[PDB]
């Protein structure tokens, strides 16, 4: 009971990191124009913050950070620096709303260096966050003493980052809960998905009092990336439907993912949360009898909350035009006769070149909107 | 730290359910021969149990269950039934090693006693499970497991059929169940909200002894705990245990075998075997972290049959992209093979723009060593 009072499950902010973490994705090479498209779409979608690659990284990186701060977006624009006064100056000139100071223990000297940079940023009227890299493989007592010191100085947020992807949910819960007892400020969390824990860790972090979670569209990032944006929203929606459906424009998630999928040349995985081919499907037939209750009894995600029309009850392999129509009708693409013709021409010239895959259905449909 | 004594993180069994949960996957239509292939590959990979679609489901289900029990596999073959005596008779005749009795208050426990004792009298292992355990009345559920434990079963089963359970709620439930019963505990987790691997992990921490998985997680809706994903997690917790128990270098072929049968791509971000799993960004974006990218390698590629993390500077295109990935996968490609692959890769880009998913797709037909 009492700890429910600290839970942030229906009162948190997303720090969208497709334009920071996502630039570490193996196939991400965003140009200025494509970053701007993504920033605008993220803002329309309803995230509170977007984070950008450090403006010290490169020239184009500094220019793009300046351009994005000039767009008039509703969400706040963040970036990050190393703990050097040099970098801080560059960052505050760009027009960002906040700066993360990142350090690694991954001792008395850290506290001193960190104070100069924190007060400089603060004096420029800018939000300041203080974070550690590889927080779960850093000495616990040193880490916490450091957060305590910077809390006494005054920052807006402190950050925990599982950079390596080894943290487990109850381990995260316990650390965040202790951090929540040590500091008086807000708490942001960043979780790598190497072992499948990035969404679970995000959730436990919120339960323990974290106020801000980093996400990435389709989870793109270093290695297999971080907490996916869509995946977190699916989880948080189950916890509080009315909060998530009103805060975000959930019916825009598919277009937002397709925009990134195009840029980084990937297919939306068949089992992607919400938007994957198979996410809103039930098996009909001899295999529906494999559970005791009717398949429709298990619909934790309501399809129309996410812009879709139904669960598809699959009893046979739908092939050709049949597969396209079903998926298109599920996605609310009201396809004209002329559109239906191209698709079955493209879908043929595809299957004739190579034996068709379930993923190809969504792939040939990408170019279409509701 | 006393509860560490109850943890099963380095001492557990996998109940592989590609041939039960997986048949509920939208595009799964396995024939006898394909089931037999998957069952043999699973046994070689080293899982302790496979689960099969109930032999009451259809004629072909019944036939396929019989055939698989006759293959001489090392792993135990399980099936499941409803709490009905007729179903029990069919199941025991098939030659399975174990039967799960699945239910949805006094009437339940009388019927359950009847079925359990029958199965036990055949010298077959018996498991008692509930469907949608996390949306059932807690006190009725636990009283039920207690009663069934006094009768004596080999295992009790918790199933998050709907995919709403959270890791700490899983931990508390399994932990209470471990206090209530004296027997083994199996857990089944759906992945609608991304919690299936975390729930599996927490269940092991709390004393569960058996976890259901599926290849690529395939199952009803977006499926259950994935086989590869669970092993990646469990490998980090105990590398020596996982690497000596499973044949992890056969994971890719195992997934490709299923992927081909159910007509899907291997997702770009798939645990271990996805295009991107063993990649670092090189360049201006390597500077986004403080430490060298190679500091963050919780999974060692050579433990999973791979040769390196690929350090990505530019966009590798054409045969340059194929070569990089084939060398990562230890596919020693002949000049003849390298030729035909370059032929196809263009005879595909000339139909449309290449996804990085395509690289793994054209490589599927190729084996290591
Ligand atoms: N990619 C960085 C992000 C740290 C974010 C800190 N606010 C990491 O994994 O450590
Ligand atoms: N498909 C069933 C499997 C139950 C397994 C119980 N041993 C479910 O999700 O509930
Ligand atoms: Na406090
Ligand atoms: Na006990
Ligand atoms: Zn990161
Ligand atoms: Zn299931």
Pairing mode of beta strands B310-312, A312-314: unpaired
Backbone angles phi, psi at B363, to 5 degrees: -85, -10
Q: How far apart (Å, rounded) are the C-alpha atoms in residues B341 and B333?
A: 10
Q: Tell me: do B137 and B226 sit in the same domain.
A: yes
What's the length of chain A? 370
What is the three-class DSSP state of A215? strand
Task: Tell which phi-psi region holds residue B89, choosing left (phi > 0), alpha (psi between -120 and 50) or beta.
Answer: alpha
Task: Identify the CATH number of the domain in which residue B132 sits.
Answer: 3.20.20.70
DSSP B157-202: EEEESSS---HHHHHHHHHHHHHH-SSEEEEEEB-TTS-HHHHHHH
**Cβ of A159 less than 6 Å from ligand 1:** yes
Enter the DSSP assignment of B61: H
Give, in order, the Cα–Cα distances in Å from A259 to each of A39, A50, A252, B39: 11, 16, 11, 40
Question: Torsion angle of alpha carbons B134, B137, B140, B146, nearest 10°?
Answer: 20
User: Residue B357: which H helix or E strand, with range?
Assistant: helix B356-363
* Residues A117, A83 contacting (CB under 8 angstroms): yes
Structure-determination approach: X-ray
Handedness of CA A348, A349, A355, A357 (dihedral sign): negative
Q: How far is the alpha carbon of B281 from chain A, nearest alpha carbon, in Å? A: 5
Task: Check pocket membership of B21 for ligand 2, CB cut-off 6 A.
Answer: yes
Beta strands in A17-107 (DSSP E): 49-52, 76-82, 98-103
User: What number of CA atoms fall less than 13 Å from residue B22's CA on the CB side?
Assistant: 30
Give the count of beta carbons closer than 10 Å to the beta carbon of residue A52: 24
Q: Does B223 touch chain A (CB under 8 A)?
A: yes
Tell whether B200 and B117 lie within a shared domain: yes
Q: Please tell me what resolution, in angstroms, this structure has.
A: 2.4
Looking at A267, A291, A319, which one is the last position of a domain? Answer: A267
Nearest to B125 by CA among B135, B116, B138: B116
For residue A150, count CB atoms less than 10 angstroms from its CB and return exposed for 0-12, middle for 13-18, buried for 19 or more: buried
Q: How far apart are CA B155 and CA B128, in angstroms?
A: 6
Same-domain status, A8 and A107:
yes
Domain boundary among A267, A288, A313: A267
Q: How far are the Cα atoms of A125, A176, B21, B271, B333 from residue B203, in angstroms, in the given order?
A: 47, 21, 19, 20, 43
Largest CA distance in chain B: 71
Q: Do A131 and A251 share a structural domain?
A: yes
- Note the ligand closest to the C-alpha atom of A151: 3
How many CB atoms neighbour CB A319 within 10 A?
A: 11
SS3 of residue B9 by DSSP:
coil
CA distance B145 to B178: 11
Q: Where are the alpha helices (DSSP H) in B98-166?
A: 106-121, 138-151
**Measured between CB atoms, which of A195, A201, A279 is closest to B221?**
A279
CA A368 – CA A331 distance, rounded (Å)? 10
Q: How far is CA B320 from CA A78, A216, B28, B118, B284, in A?
A: 36, 28, 34, 62, 22
* Whether the CB of B188 sits within 6 Å of ligand 2: yes
Q: Tell me: do A258 and A111 sit in the same domain.
A: yes
> Is A269 in the B-facing interface, judged by CB distances under 8 Å?
yes
Q: How far is the C-alpha of B75 from the C-alpha of B283, rounded, in Å?
A: 47
Within this chain, do residues A246 and A278 fall inside the same structural domain, yes or no?
no
User: Distance between the two ends of chain B, CA-based, in angstroms?
Assistant: 45
3-state class (DSSP) for residue A102: strand
DSSP strand pairing (B310-312 vs B49-52): unpaired
Cα gap B321→B335, rounded to integer Å: 16
- Give the Cα separation of A290 and A122 in Å (integer): 60
User: What residues contact residue B64 under an 8 Å CB cut-off, 6+ apart?
Assistant: B32, B35, B36, B52, B53
Q: How many domains does chain B have?
A: 2
> Whose structure tokens read 């509703």?
A74
A110 within 8 A of A82, measured Cβ to Cβ = no
Ligand 4 mean position, distance from CA B225 (Å) = 26
Instruction: State which residues form the domain around A333.
Output: 268-370
Dihedral over alpha carbons A165, B10, B173, B3 (to 10 degrees): -100
Q: Which of A267, A293, A315 is a domain's end point? A: A267
Residue matched to tokens 């209530």: B180
* Cβ-Cβ contacts under 8 Å, A273 against chain B: 192-194, 222
Comparing C-alpha atoms, which of B64, B57, B12, B3 is closest to residue B38? B64
Phi, psi of A158 (to 5 degrees): -115, 150
Cβ neighbours, 10 Å, residue B150? 12
Cβ of residue A90 closer than 8 Å to a chain B Cβ: no
Closest residue in chain B to residue A79, using alpha carbons only: B288
Same structural domain, B22 and B168: yes
Is there a contact between A196 and A166 (Cβ–Cβ < 8 Å)? no
Classify residue B22 as exposed, middle or buried by CB count within 10 Å of its CB (0-12, 13-18, 19+). Answer: buried
Q: Are residues A138 and A206 in the same domain?
A: yes
Structure letter (DSSP) for residue A228: B
Question: Using H for helix, E for strand and C for coil, what is the string for B225-278?
Answer: CEHHHHHHHHHHHCHHHHHHHCCHHHHHHHHHHHHHHCCCCCCCCCCCCCCCCC
Point out the catalytic residue in the list A287, A313, A334, A369. Answer: A287
Contact assessment for residue A72 and residue A62, using Cβ atoms and an 8 Å cutoff: no
Other beta carbons less than 10 A from residue A127's beta carbon: 18
Contacts of residue B355, Cβ cutoff 8 Å, sequence gap at least 6: A265, A266, A267, A363, B268
**In contact, B210 and B225? CB cutoff 8 Å:** no
Taking contacts as CB-CB distances below 8 angstroms, the residues of chain B near A269 are 265, 267-270
Cβ-based burial of B33 (10 A; exposed 0-12, middle 13-18, buried ≥19): exposed
Helix %, strand %, coil % of chain A (to 5):
50, 15, 40
Say if residues A210 and A8 touch (Cβ distance below 8 Å): yes
Question: How far is the C-alpha of A55 from the C-alpha of B349, rounded, in Å?
Answer: 36
Q: Are A180 and A204 in contact (CB under 8 A)?
A: no
A241 and A290 belong to one structural domain: no
Residue A229: name the closest of A174, A191, A186, A188 by CA. A191
φ and ψ at B6, to 5 degrees?
-90, -10
A15 beta partners: A49, A214
B159 lines ligand 2 (CB under 6 A): yes
Q: Are residues B324 and B210 in the same domain?
A: no
Which of A203, A224, A283 lies nearest to residue B220, judging by beta carbons?
A: A283
Contact A213, A202 (CB under 8 A): yes
Q: What is the largest CA-CA distance in chain A?
A: 71
- Give CA–CA dist A11/A201, Å, rounded: 17
Distance between CA A301 and CA B192 in Å, rounded? Answer: 8
* CB nearest to A170's CB, from B171, B191, B284: B171
Q: Are A164 and A197 in contact (CB under 8 A)?
A: no
The dihedral sign for the CA sequence B114, B116, B119, B120: negative
What distance, in Å, lies between the first and last C-alpha atoms of chain A?
A: 44
Q: Which atom of ligand 1 is nearest to the CA of A221?
A: 1
Instruction: List CB contacts of A108: < 8 A, sequence separation 6 or more.
Output: none
Same domain, A263 and A337: no
One domain, residues A119 and A169: yes
- Residue A32, token pair as written in the block: 């200025």
Question: Which helix (H) or strand (E) segment is A251 a member of?
Answer: none
Residue A297: phi and psi, rounded to 5, are -60, -25
**Spacing of C-alpha B243 from chain mean position:** 16
């Amino acid at each position: 009971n009492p700890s429910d009072f600290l839970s942030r499950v229906n009162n948190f902010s997303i720090i969208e990191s497709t334009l920071r973490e996502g630039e570490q994705f193996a196939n991400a090479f965003f140009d200025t124009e494509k970053k701007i498209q993504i920033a605008k779409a993220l803002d329309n979608f309803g995230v509170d913050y977007i984070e950008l690659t450090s403006p010290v990284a490169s020239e184009q990186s500094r220019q793009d950070c300046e351009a994005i701060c000039k767009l008039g977006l509703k969400c706040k624009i963040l970036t990050h620096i190393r703990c050097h006064m040099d970098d801080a100056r560059v960052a505050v000139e760009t027009g960002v709303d906040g700066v993360d100071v990142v350090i690694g223990t991954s001792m008395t000297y850290i506290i001193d260096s960190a104070t100069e940079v924190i007060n400089f940023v603060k004096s420029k009227g800018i939000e300041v966050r203080f974070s550690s890299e590889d927080s779960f493989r850093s000495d616990l007592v040193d880490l916490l003493s450091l957060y305590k010191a910077v809390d006494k100085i005054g920052v807006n947020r402190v950050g925990i980052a599982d950079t390596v992807g080894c943290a487990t949910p109850r381990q995260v819960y316990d650390l965040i809960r202790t951090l929540r007892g040590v500091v008086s400020c807000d708490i942001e969390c960043h979780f790598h998905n190497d072992t499948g824990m990035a969404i679970a860790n995000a959730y436990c972090a919120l339960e323990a009092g974290a106020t801000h979670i980093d996400t990435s569209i389709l989870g793109i990032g270093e290695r297999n990336g971080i907490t996916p944006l869509g995946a977190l929203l699916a989880r948080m929606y189950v916890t509080d439907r009315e909060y998530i459906t009103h805060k975000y424009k959930l019916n825009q998630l598919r277009e937002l993912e397709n925009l990134v999928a195009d840029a980084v040349e990937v297919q939306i995985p068949f089992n992607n949360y919400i938007t994957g081919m198979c996410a809103f499907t039930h098996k009909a037939g001899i295999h529906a009898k494999a559970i005791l209750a009717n398949p429709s009894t298990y619909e934790i995600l309501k399809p129309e909350d996410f812009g879709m029309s139904r669960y598809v009850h699959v009893g046979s392999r739908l092939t050709g035009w049949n597969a396209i129509k079903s998926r298109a009708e599920q996605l609310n693409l009201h396809l004209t006769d002329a559109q239906a013709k191209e698709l079955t021409v493209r879908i043929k010239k595809l299957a004739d070149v190579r034996t068709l895959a379930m993923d190809d259905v969504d792939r040939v449909l990408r170019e279409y909107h509701a």
